[model samples]
Target: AVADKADNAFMMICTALVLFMTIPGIALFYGGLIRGKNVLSMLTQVTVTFALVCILWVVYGYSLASGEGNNFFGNINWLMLKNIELTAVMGSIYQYIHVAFQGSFACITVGLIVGALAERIRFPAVLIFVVVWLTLSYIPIAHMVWGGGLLASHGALDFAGGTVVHINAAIAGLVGAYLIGKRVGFGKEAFKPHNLPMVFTGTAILYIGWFGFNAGSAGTANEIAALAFVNTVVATAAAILGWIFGEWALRGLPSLLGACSGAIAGLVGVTPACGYIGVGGALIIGVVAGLAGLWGVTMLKRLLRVDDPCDVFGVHGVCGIVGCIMTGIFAASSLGGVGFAEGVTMGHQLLVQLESIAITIVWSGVVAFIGYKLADLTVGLRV
Candidate 1:
């Protein structure tokens, strides 16, 4: 296939935007969430792991995740990007751009995990978990959803990375929170964020960067991309309102932190459905996602009994699931979506979505447990 200049240029911009989400985006977001004493370590961990995922993605991650293979994994043909022509085109853009764009997603997913494990996790242990989890969990799920693997074959409709990026990393974070145990004086000390402004800045960056993330999944400057772009904006705005309203009702005041969290909830919820569903569906999903995310951080966090400092599982995990399932319902033409395949019904689609979510949760949870166990066996899990 020939690479179009327009698509090429668009993808490059999207790639850069996504990379921006991790560096200053997640760095500041996670950095501001922890206490002042641990902010430096949080920043360092995110930066180092961002680079680590990038390098590994180029080395073998792209190969085994994207190369043609079976249901769960790809072949090693593209290891270190070998055996591919420089001009090779994938989906109207150069394969190189695809690699960078996809690699950026990998970077942010790893960045997400670090927030949950910050402060208490040993740096060496974090490195080990990144390597293991990326190889076993992230790669396989990516292949399944986007790499022409099992989920794709089953007609799973992840326009972006609801399962691959958000749910995958969220489950891993939850597992690590359990395995790594609580931070010293987690509840008793009333650990609060050191920098609300930094969190707000990070949230803004993530919101701006998400346009590229949701729209770029179309891989071209087309109507689908425009639709995704608009859906992203509306969903996030609605989610902010939903969260702040809930906060006002229960907490007696709406806060900046709640608004930021709601924005992310909407973004996560709309990710899988944005390109397929209409603006109405996007709005409904946003409202529900915001409320759901609020419950995730408050009630669900307590129920889980894990000391996840950054609420990684609460926001990303819960809303990712909400988005995935909603994608199935809202994707129906009756609901203003692009519509399912000729033979596919809404019920069938919902079943497939649930299956995908279940598989991701189990697969990522198992790999995370092993990764943390290996790290604990080696350098120890806690600092």
Candidate 2:
């Protein structure tokens, strides 16, 4: 019991570290990347959304995510933390600690979308969007993936938040870019980043904090946590190289943006596979993620002609898809993956993984559209 309590306390601290990654880490990263005129507003949006997520998670997000429900989602039996006492055991820890830990995830997920749209969307509208998206998209997905929903019942593995966090935010951000319209003076102007150093600093903080993010997802202090920790380091290193090499080969020089972006690309890519793969698989995943991110920014976004400022879709969306799919290929016992059940082959796992990704993309896109429309009608979305 004492050991369980200690584990719970450690996990709580780790959750806090992951939550920190979004607030100042992601906020400052986006803040530095955008034009100076938008920095203050973006920071405000990130901070406020972070707070709002925390509050909402306590009220309803946790209940819907962790509470028992059907295959699609959980019931609201735990709403406002009603029946949960401070000392009530939930798994290895008290229910209160679980609430705080999961609440942090809700906070970061909303932060990702809010930060992306901060430069273009109105504050009140963005807040409203957060609520709608969180309730409809994030919560249900969390329940499905982590709360013994259909996906988990089928043996799908997401060590961290490939579906719930990265993909969820990516789709929402894509929808927001469309509904909110482009930046005021977007096309004609250069619109360079305001503070590269801050971007670098933020990236560093995110990297440091990710140790907690990936490792803590194990829910226990064990070998899986150690595996996640090492894979995190290896993947990040390989991705930095992959991105830097691509930048040098294509653009003639490795820019600071390329480096920082590469780090995040690797981190995001390995998130889903951290616990399921070995160091070698992690390296491959990172390399693919970095290259895919570069192409998403350079080729895909330009071809699509959408302003995905900060490349939320490019980095998180594309890389997340890549990693989730790759998890099927690399998650064999030989490669340190959690290995499939008897009679489950890579082909079967891949199909399940694709199904999960498809559901996330479609569901998030539809809900995000509605959220944006509501925000537009209610408070107006344009700046």
Candidate 3:
């Protein structure tokens, strides 16, 4: 009992650190990447979305995710967190701790979108859209992937949020780009980051905070946590090098922005596999993630001509896909992966992984479109 309390307390603190990653950390990171006039708007969107996620998670997000329900989602019995007391034991710790930890994830998920779209959308409209998207897109996806839903039953392994958070946000941002329309002066504008120092500071904080985000996913301070911690370090270093090399090859010089962006790419890439793969696997994943991110932002975005302001798709979506697929290869027992259950082969696991990724992309795209439409109707669009 005593040990359990200690563990719960530690987890709660770590959860707070993870939550901090998205608020000031992500907001500042993107704030420096956009025009000065857009910084306030972006910061407002992130702050409001963070607050909204916190409230909704406590009310219905937790219930829909963790409660008993169908394969795709959970029951709403715990709405408003009803009947859950201070001393309630959920698995190894208090139920409140679980709620707080999960709520943090919801906050960061919304932050990803808010940071990307603040320059294009009106404040009120964006806030409304977040509420709708959180309810429809974030909750159901969270249920399906993490909350004992269809994906869980099928043996999908997302040690952290690959599909639920990254893919979900990327699709939603894309839908928002279509609905909200491109920036007023996109092609004509000569926009560059207003503050490189803030970007660096934000990156530093995000790096430090990620320890909590990846490690806390273990739900216990055990070998899994140790593995995740080491993998995070190794993968991030490799990704930096990969991104720098790519930048040098393509752009002639390694820009600071490229370095910072590469760091984030590696972090997002390793998130899902941190708990499943080893340091060697992490290094490989990081290099892939960085290279993929560089390509996504440079070649893919230009060829496709999609204005994903912060490259949410470039860093999170592209790297997330890389990490998820790589998990199948590196998660062998010999490579420090948790390995498959009895009778499970690499081929079978790869199929399951592809299925999970496909489901997330399709579902999130559809729901995000609907959510943006609803927000458009409610608050009206435009900056």
Candidate 4:
């Protein structure tokens, strides 16, 4: 139950970095992508939802996800966070820091969803959707992945929330886009970004904070943190080049939005594997993610015809799945990665990844449907 000052300090800073990813980072990234008329409204919705996520995390999310319940959910032992001891220790750091850090993730996940869909959907409806989804899909899936539930027991490898954050939110976002229906003039014309510079700035912030996102998942300032940190850097660089090269070959030009999209693709692709795979694995994952992300926002999204303004499902969901699956391949000792667990084969690990991914998709999709239904029943769906 002893707390290390260094660990405490590092966790606090990392928590702040993650929170930054939501506020100015996600808000601005999505803000610039939306029409100018809706920028102010987008920012307000994001800010409010971010606050709402934090409050929910503190009041019940942390408890229901981590507070020791059955396989599907957790107990409410920490209702309102009132039961937490000031001196509780978690992995050599104060448990309070753990709470804050975990809560920060919840905020960003909701922020990602709200930021992407708020421009077209009603504010109260989205808020209600957020509550229902976070409570049903997000919190429960987090428990399954991070809180020693079904997926974790089956040995899913998520270094930094490939499933919990990226794919989980992405699927929910896609479902939301589908149920919410297309935006006005969605297919009639392009919805060009209003401010590329602001998008760049927010993407930069997201990149910088993501070091905390990937490495801090190590839960210690140790070798794993160093590995995750370096892998993140190398993978991001590779993804940018891969995306630019791909765009130049096909589209004839590389745009700022393309670069930003590549950056996020790398970040998401490396998230689940950063701590498990080697440097070479990181590069391969980055390149693949870059190419696949282009397809996601272009081909896959077009096929689905969901009018997703921010491409949340395109980048986060596609790359997250790629990362999770690759972790199984590259994490094998044969690939210069940390070896698989004792008595676990690469094939078995791949199966686990697929299972986890499938479960997350189905789980989040169902909850999102319910969330949207509740919203529709309560407030009018459209603006």
Better of 2 and 3 by lDDT: 2
lDDT tens per residue, model 1, 1-383:
99999999999999898888888898888777777778888888888988899999999999989999999999899989999899999999999999999999899899889865867799989999999999999999999999999999999988999999999999999888777665555452433544778888988988888888999999998999999999999999989999899989989999888999999999999999999999999999999999989988987557655434557578999999999999999998888999997699999999999999999999999999999999999999988
Clash counts for all predictions: 0, 1, 0, 0
The alpha-carbon lDDT assigned to residue 351 of candidate 2 equals: 91
What is the per-residue lDDT of model 3 for residues 165-248, given as tens digits with 9 covering 90 to 100? 887887787677667765545552433644778887878778877887888888777788789888888888888889999999
Question: For candidate 3, what is the TM-score?
Answer: 0.95
Candidate ordering by TM-score (highest first):
1, 4, 2, 3
* Alpha-carbon lDDT, every model: 0.89, 0.83, 0.81, 0.86
Give candidate 1's error at residue 294 in angstroms.
0.6
Instruction: Identify the leading candidate in terms of lDDT.
Output: 1
Candidate 3 pairs with clashing backbones: none
Give all TM-scores, in the order shown.
Answer: 0.97, 0.95, 0.95, 0.96
lDDT of 2 by residue, 215-271 (tens): 888776788888899989988888888999999999899988889889988988899
Q: Where is model 3 poorest over a 10-residue stretch in terms of lDDT?
A: 184-193
Q: Rank by lDDT, descending?
A: 1, 4, 2, 3
Colliding residue pairs in candidate 2: 276-337
Q: Please estimate how well model 3 matches the true structure, expressed as its whole-model Cα lDDT.
A: 0.81
